[PDB]
Amino acid sequence: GKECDCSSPENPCCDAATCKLRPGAQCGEGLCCEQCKFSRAGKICRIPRGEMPDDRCTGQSADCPRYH
Secondary structure, three states: OOOOOOOOOOOOOOOOHHHHHHHOOOOOOOOOOOOEOOOEEEEEEEEEOOOOOOOOEEEOOOOOOOOO
């Protein structure tokens, strides 16, 4: 939601008292977060093993969702 965009209580990119981002970072953590910022689409966040499609972040997505 908008009360805790970070679960790391020791991350310097998110304030614990608020559990959110303290600086101007767009994310405190995530599979597609480059420097606490929203990576760009075309970002592989998960790799399939056997016969599955790859997981490319849409860039505006910090964490990585699912595909199959």
